[PDB]
Structure 1
Amino acid sequence: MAPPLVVVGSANADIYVEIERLPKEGETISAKTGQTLAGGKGANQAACGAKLMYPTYFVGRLGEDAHGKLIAEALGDDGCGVHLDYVRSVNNEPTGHAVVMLQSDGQNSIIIVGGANMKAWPEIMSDDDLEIVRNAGIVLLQREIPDSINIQVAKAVKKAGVPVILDVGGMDTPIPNELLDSIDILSPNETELSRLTGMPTETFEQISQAVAKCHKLGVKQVLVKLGSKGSALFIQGEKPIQQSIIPAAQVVDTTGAGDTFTAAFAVAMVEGKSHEECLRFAAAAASLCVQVKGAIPSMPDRKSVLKLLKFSI
């Protein structure tokens, strides 16, 4: 086959509940409604690539439970078409999940259980496992699995010569410099970029400043996601490429948009498109993503993204 998109990272059951207010301590309240959906930044990114019709493998750890089966079904042959050969399930850990509480004011609130995502990985990565990443055309990581696993994967691709992208989404902890040294593209949003470098990110000069610091952490390319403000690709020693959002007819649900943007950029990149085309393609995929409820259900197919591109730029 063509050199595959290989995603190593998390899979979550997202437990959404609609409440009026957050419950007080010791207090029992009722929710209006609820929904449980397949998610996790890793599974999201893999679903995205598969829907865009690029050969995609997901490397992850699931529990042997209902939440785990939910994931496999959404991603697999009856869903997005992700190759699940390297997903392993354990019986001593639960599939990771997130209780997402949508209050009536408009904000969100999240409790995350690491589960298999954080606990079912081996101390040392098997060669059998590392062979898929060694055959990748491009590798995507996030920060919802252990740093140790991320580092071992990145290093295994370094000694293989193929792009490794690290989405900063996930844990709010500082990134191991050992990890930064081993990736090709860093991909943060505004807060993550700010939190990471400590520097303000309210303005483009400020953002460029924060990126300059990323360059000094050893990262040659930074793909900054600015939400409504668009995106930019910074390549050390070159002029930044900026891309505004592709406006959506209706913003229904932004869940998974960051994941969509990153995975679509990766597909465009591994297909050999120019950096400008990559940013445009990613922006169009993200634009479609936000018009449908749910992360994985909202992943657009390639022809829709290309159609939006034709008529938006």
Structure 2
Amino acid sequence: MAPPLVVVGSANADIYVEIERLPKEGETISAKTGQTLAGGKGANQAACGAKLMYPTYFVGRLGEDAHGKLIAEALGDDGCGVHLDYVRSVNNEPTGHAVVMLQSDGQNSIIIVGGANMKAWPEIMSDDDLEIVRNAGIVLLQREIPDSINIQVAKAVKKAGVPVILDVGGMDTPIPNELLDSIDILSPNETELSRLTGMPTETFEQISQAVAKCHKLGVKQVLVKLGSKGSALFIQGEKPIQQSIIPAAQVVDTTGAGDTFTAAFAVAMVEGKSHEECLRFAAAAASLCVQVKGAIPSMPDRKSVLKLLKFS
């Protein structure tokens, strides 16, 4: 009954097919194999939070189709234990999905269908949806749903005094200043930090500088994801702190690990942990995540993260 993690964002069916080579206009080919998996940054972050045994709601839009049931199954009672009260399904849009064509040479080809993620939201968020974010302990957004929705959520949480984190992952359009001005923590990776600031991010000094531009744009806190280099938390009026990776024994699959990092950070934060302990909690979670194939099935339970953290 603690103030919940509330994730508002995307849910996707990820349709992976293993093919020797791409087809041609008319060519029917046969994949070696194929699998369809629950994904999307919003669903991933919600799954992570629920698996960490923190009360978590997902606010998203699905189609009334098989891929929608796939997501609900993965996230809900028989899966991760996300509260799905505020997920709505519609009959005029497909569940969002991605066709991923892994090829016999190492190259990926992807078709992304935004579907319900981009087209099933209302013009104006319902009072019901806004009520769950007002009652949240913390709110997580990404950029795989319309700016309109992110902005309306951001405004409500700001008035309610609820912290909100915006993951920059998703579409590569500019971020509206009204969104930047209404969020507590911006969370880009190195490449995303560069794209929105038009500055280099090859060195930590360059990163600090792009982050300085972020402060000027209205963002008091930036949680920078650095891949193998770990992460860095920048708070205006303070010294940037850093956390290196907690090295994985083996990197099986980095899919979902940035989402795990972000959501785990949010869980540690809302649990009242220090900034240092938040970064380390998140590092530990991302680390367990990359050691296992897949996205949502790779995400660690609280017991495993805490176990890994114990090590000296």
**Same fold at TM > 0.5:** yes
Distance 2:74 2:263 in 1: 17
Q: TM-score, normalised by structure 2?
A: 0.97
Q: Deviations over 1:246-279 (max 9, x none)?
A: 1111111111011000000000000000000000
CA drift of 1:292 comes to 1.1
Aligned residues: 312
Please say which of residues 24-33 and 60-69 is displaced more in the overlay: 24-33
Distance 1:160 1:148 in 2: 19
Q: Tell me what 2:311 maps to.
A: 311
**Structure 1 residues 6, 228: CA separation in 2 closer, same or farther (over 3 Å shift)?**
same
Distance 1:206 1:110 in 2: 32
Q: Which runs of 5+ in 2 are unaligned?
A: none
Q: Deviations over 1:95-148 (max 9, x none)?
A: 000111222333433221010010110000111111000100000000000000
CA drift of 1:303 comes to 1.0
Q: TM-score, normalised by structure 1?
A: 0.97
Distance 2:84 2:199 in 1: 40
Distance 1:180 1:167 in 2: 11
CA drift of 1:29 comes to 3.4
Distance 2:106 2:234 in 1: 33
CA drift of 1:24 comes to 4.8
RMSD across aligned positions (CA): 1.1
Q: Deviations over 1:212-245 (max 9, x none)?
A: 1111110000000011111000101211111111
Q: Tell me what 2:270 maps to.
A: 270
Identical residues among aligned pairs (%): 100
**Structure 1 residues 109, 245: CA separation in 2 closer, same or farther (over 3 Å shift)?**
farther
Distance 2:196 2:254 in 1: 23
**Structure 1 residues 291, 107: CA separation in 2 closer, same or farther (over 3 Å shift)?**
farther
CA drift of 1:25 comes to 5.1
Distance 2:259 2:15 in 1: 18
**Structure 1 residues 227, 24: CA separation in 2 closer, same or farther (over 3 Å shift)?**
farther
Distance 1:115 1:137 in 2: 29
Q: Deviations over 1:142-181 (max 9, x none)?
A: 0000000000000000000011000000001111111000
CA drift of 1:190 comes to 1.0
Distance 2:122 2:242 in 1: 40
CA drift of 1:311 comes to 1.1
Distance 2:159 2:287 in 1: 36
CA drift of 1:23 comes to 3.8
Distance 2:126 2:24 in 1: 46
**Structure 1 residues 203, 26: CA separation in 2 closer, same or farther (over 3 Å shift)?**
farther
Distance 1:192 1:84 in 2: 30
Q: Deviations over 1:24-74 (max 9, x none)?
A: 555443322111100000000000000000000000000000000000000
CA drift of 1:22 comes to 3.7
Please say which of residues 192-201 and 97-106 is displaced more in the overlay: 97-106
Please say which of residues 171-180 and 107-116 is displaced more in the overlay: 107-116
Please say which of residues 267-276 and 246-255 is displaced more in the overlay: 246-255
Distance 2:105 2:208 in 1: 34
Q: Tell me what 1:243 maps to.
A: 243
Secondary structure of 1:14's partner? Answer: strand
**Structure 1 residues 20, 273: CA separation in 2 closer, same or farther (over 3 Å shift)?**
same
**Structure 1 residues 107, 262: CA separation in 2 closer, same or farther (over 3 Å shift)?**
farther
Distance 2:108 2:167 in 1: 21
